[PDB]
Amino acid sequence: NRPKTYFCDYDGCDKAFTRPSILTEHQLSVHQGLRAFQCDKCAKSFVKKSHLERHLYTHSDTKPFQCSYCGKGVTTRQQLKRHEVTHTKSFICPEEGCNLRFYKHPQL
Amino acid sequence: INIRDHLATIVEVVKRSKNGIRQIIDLKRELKFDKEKRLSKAFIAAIAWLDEKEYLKKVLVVSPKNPAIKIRCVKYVKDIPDNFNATDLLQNQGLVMEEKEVLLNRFYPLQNQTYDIADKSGLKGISTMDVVN
Amino acid sequence: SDFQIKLDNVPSAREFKSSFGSLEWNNFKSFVNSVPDNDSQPQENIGNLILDRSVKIPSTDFQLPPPPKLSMVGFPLLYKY
Ligand SMILES: [Zn+2]
Ligand SMILES: [Zn+2]
Ligand SMILES: [Zn+2]
Ligand SMILES: [Zn+2]
Numbered sequence: 001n002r003p004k005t006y007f008c009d010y011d012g013c014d015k016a017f018t019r020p021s022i023l024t025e026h027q028l029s030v031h032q033g034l035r036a037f038q039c040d041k042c043a044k045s046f047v048k049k050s051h052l053e054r055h056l057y058t059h060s061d062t063k064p065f066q067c068s069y070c071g072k073g074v075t076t077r078q079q080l081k082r083h084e085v086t087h088t089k090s091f092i093c094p095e096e097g098c099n100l101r102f103y104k105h106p107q108l
Numbered sequence: 109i110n111i112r113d114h115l116a117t118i119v120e121v122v123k124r125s126k127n128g129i130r131q132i133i134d135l136k137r138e139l140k141f142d143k144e145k146r147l148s149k150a151f152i153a154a155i156a157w158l159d160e161k162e163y164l165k166k167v168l169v170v171s172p173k174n175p176a177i178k179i180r181c182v183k184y185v186k187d188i189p190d191n192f193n194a195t196d197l198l199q200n201q202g203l204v205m206e207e208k209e210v211l212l213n214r215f216y217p218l219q220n221q222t223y224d225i226a227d228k229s230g231l232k233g234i235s236t237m238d239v240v241n
Numbered sequence: 242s243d244f245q246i247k248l249d250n251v252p253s254a255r256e257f258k259s260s261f262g263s264l265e266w267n268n269f270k271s272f273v274n275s276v277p278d279n280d281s282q283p284q285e286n287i288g289n290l291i292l293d294r295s296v297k298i299p300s301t302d303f304q305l306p307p308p309p310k311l312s313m314v315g316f317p318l319l320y321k322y
Contacts (some may be wrong), residue, residue: 027138031124200293
């Protein structure tokens, strides 16, 4: 919506941003080499609250997305969708007019 | 925040800026010295000191289409041993760099004086900041 | 054909083309008025003078203009390994 009208000034940086706090998040993270959210359970650190929140689940068994078929736990919707698509007849015969459909790619 | 440690960072940040130029308001914004007037005062003093000690140079840049829209910027010089963000305007050709070193007529009423400069300025008009200044 | 170098996004080349190539008087005055009467930093990169950021250029590039003949031979040499 609103136009990108805050330009990073550093040598060899191309980026422009919508609102000045975001330009500052970029500058402190990329160019100065500082981060604002530390893991309690390992050495790593993160640039956003949502990124530390994802990393915190990785230290735990009670992972926040749970499979509808097998009940395996995962941390975000992309992982869930890819995993659940393995519980489907995903693959299709690529050859002309052939009707068949398959569950594991080596079968196809 | 102890500004005495940050002077090296201010010189290195300006040194790493495109063509060695950075807007002073944008530099305050990067280091987050904008959170409190206490931090603002510390930053303005530091920039002035680096200018006086000749590590940096305060310079103006002038909008090629508007002499009143000028940008306060710091220019890099050597290593340590009006408030609108203009990072938009600095994207143009904008080559009007300037390193740093009243018309009031008693007899005619003020009405006619603003009229005369608003006329003499032509079809491009004049801004209130030009008229007052 | 000789080695070809593209100057489309080199700041000083754009200033030269738009002045000495165009013959536009507004551009020519702006250009000569910008040439220093004497140069105090002939050791530093020309980018420090030419502020224009509309062009992507690394500060490792001194905007060195290219020679009029790079291939000193018009035909391939006989290396043959
Ligand atoms: Zn950047
Ligand atoms: Zn961790
Ligand atoms: Zn599952
Ligand atoms: Zn088939």
